[PDB]
Structures are given as structure tokens and as C-alpha cells.
């Protein structure tokens, strides 16, 4: 089960993840990346309906073996807070950013807020796959995976 999103050049985009939060539990959020800059065409990761032997059939993104070997897992940003209040000016969060991937490319790091990642000017260095994780002090863990590719490749 993965989300399919289509973007266009010079048009902004945003990714939001389903969240089921409970007040009073200290919470941590993590964002990741998985690029496809060197993985173009059929070698690029693609959505396929992977079916089990008899019971389970779900959508999953398949990545080429060479592309996977040329791809390294990276951390984009980490957020820590505690759920409280209804507004947003009453919610403080602590952010840790160790993402050096976008520093060498001389690009703009994405704008990350609780449950939302936004990019203003889409380029060809932003395409790929994103992994989002939420953990808590009660032992709860939730995972999600987004996929952003070029516009028009869905039909093909």
C-alpha cells in the first residue's frame, strides 16, 4: 500500500501523512529519502500490485537492483514534541536536521512541519520516494511511503 502523486515542473507540491495522535504522549517524527536521479526509465522504481500466494494483494514500489545498490538511505529531518492544544501557536517542537544530501546539490531543503512536507519550485532533483515514520513513548509505531515521479508516466 503506497500513495501515487503526480507533480509538474515549476509547480509546488505537498505531502501529508495520516496521523492519529493522542494527547500527553511524547512523540517523535522522522522523514527520509530515496532518490531516482540515476534511475530513469524502466530502471526507475514503479508501482506494482504484488500478490501473495492465496490471500494478500497489495500495491508496492519495486526498485531496480542496480538502482537500489546505487541508493543509500538518508535522514531528511527529525521532529520531537508533545501533543497539546488545538491551535498551532501553542505547540512547540524541536527539530534536528542532519540532511547533508541537499547541501552538496546547492538546492533548497524541503519545508517540514508536523505531518506536512512542502516544496515550492519542483525540479528534476526532487523525484523519488519518501519514507515517513512516527513513534511514541507508549510503544506505537506508524509507517508510510510516498512516491513522486514525472507527470504523464502513469499512463505508460
Amino acid at each position, epitope marked *: 500500500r503506497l500513495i501515487e502523486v503526480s507533480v509538474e515542473e515549476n509547480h509546488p507540491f505537498t505531502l501529508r501523512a495520516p496521523i492519529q495522535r493522542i494527547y500527553g504522549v511524547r512523540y517523535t517524527e522522522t522523514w527520509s529519502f530515496l532518490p531516482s536521479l540515476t534511475c530513469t526509465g524502466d530502471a526507475a522504481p514503479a508501482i506494482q500490485h504484488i500478490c501473495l500466494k492465496h490471500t494478500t494483494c497489495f500495491q508496492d514500489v519495486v526498485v531496480d537492483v542496480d538502482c537500489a545498490e546505487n541508493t543509500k538511505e538518508d535522514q531528511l529531518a527529525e521532529i520531537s514534541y508533545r501533543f*497539546q492544544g488545538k491551535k498551532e501557536a501553542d505547540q512547540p517542537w524541536i527539530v534536528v536536521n542532519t540532511s547533508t544530501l541537499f547541501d552538496e546539490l546547492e538546492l533548497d531543503p524541503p519545508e517540514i512541519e508536523p505531518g506536512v512536507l512542502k516544496v515550492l519550485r519542483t525540479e528534476k532533483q526532487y523525484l523519488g520516494v519518501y519514507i515517513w515514520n512516527m513513534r511514541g*513513548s507508549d510503544g506505537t509505531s506508524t509507517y508510510a511511503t510516498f512516491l513522486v515521479t514525472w507527470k504523464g508516466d502513469e499512463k505508460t
Partner: antibody
Amino acid sequence: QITLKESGPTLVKPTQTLTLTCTFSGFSLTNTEMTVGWIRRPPGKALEWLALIYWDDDKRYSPSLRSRLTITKDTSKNQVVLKMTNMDPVDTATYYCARLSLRLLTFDYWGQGTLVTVSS
Amino acid sequence: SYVVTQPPSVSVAPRQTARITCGGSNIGSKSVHWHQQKPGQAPVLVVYDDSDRPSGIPERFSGSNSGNTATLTITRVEAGDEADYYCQVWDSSGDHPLFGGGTKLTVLG
């Protein structure tokens, strides 16, 4: 229903130590939405914040009187204890203990408070 | 730290409308609450989280929150409404509650 009561001494000599107890019933601190706080009132002055305690032993202390406070909790017997040392004559007041919910950030339930007086 | 200021004293002639303001730099985005207490009594809550009502609270109290104003309005005022009112906020820089200076209501006439 939520019930809160306060207990302790009433006379404190100058520069000694003061202890007070706030007891609660109707809820358990094991729930992750309840906090217990302490505040005070001088003669005809503003309601001043003193301290706040969470479920996970976190502490929130007043900026003005940070160095001279201690607050402890006991979930087994549903008790909260406060220790305030080095009393001063101009600190005579009435002290209150109250409950706070993390879903509204405002104190909802209060007790009756008790008098604290310094004299020789 | 956030700074919140309110006028000290306001007097209203009998049976009229009284409005008490809690104001501060960009106070609309923050939640502001009202606490009421009579002399020699335990304080009571009346209005919490931008103008809703808890059980038992009188209906003559109304709250508004916009811009740089949080207004508490009481209509059909008796002598029994003479009490001390406070506006409370959650300061985010220190992550702690903050009270004001208090307001006193005078019922002449």
C-alpha cells in the same frame, strides 16, 4: 466527580522550611492528560503561579522562584507534596492546588486552599 | 516571554453591560481564558478556550477573540457580579501557564 483537598501547618517561623499536601480523588494520574499544579495569592495581589507536575515526573517551575521549590507525586496513594524552604514574612499568603488538562491549557478544577502565615 | 496587560479597574452603573479586555501583541492566535473569584472564596472558571460554556456557568457571560482583543462581556449586571476577573494564557517560550494582573469590577448605583 473530582475532589481536591489541602492540608498542612499554618504557622512558619522566618527562614524555616514549609511543607504542604494536596490530595485528590475521582481520577488517576496514570491517565496521560492530567497535571497537578500549585499557586498562591497574597493580600489583594495577583494569582501567582508556583509549580506544575506531569505524569512522567516532568517538572515546571516558576521563573521568579525557581531555585527554592520542590514538588513530588505519589500515584499509589493519590497524593502530591510540595516543599518550599526559606520562608519570609512578606510571603504570607493563601495557597491553592488545582488540576490542569493538556487538551485546553487552562485550570479547570480547584481546591479550597490554606493559609500560610509567618510570625515570631 | 509573552506580555499580557489589562486595565486595572472598570466601574459600571447598575443593570448595564460590562466589557473586560485581555490584550497583547498578536493575541488572536493564542487561546485566552477567563477565571473568576470573589473575595474570601475559591476561584471558579467561567469561559475557556475561546467562548464555549461549561455546565452551570451563567449565560450572561460572552467571549470574543480576534486580532489583539479578547473581550468578556456581561449583560444584566447585578451587585453579585462584583468580583475579580483574570485572563490566563499558555506562554509557549517558557511552555508554562501565565496569569495577568487581575481586574476588579465595581457595581455602583
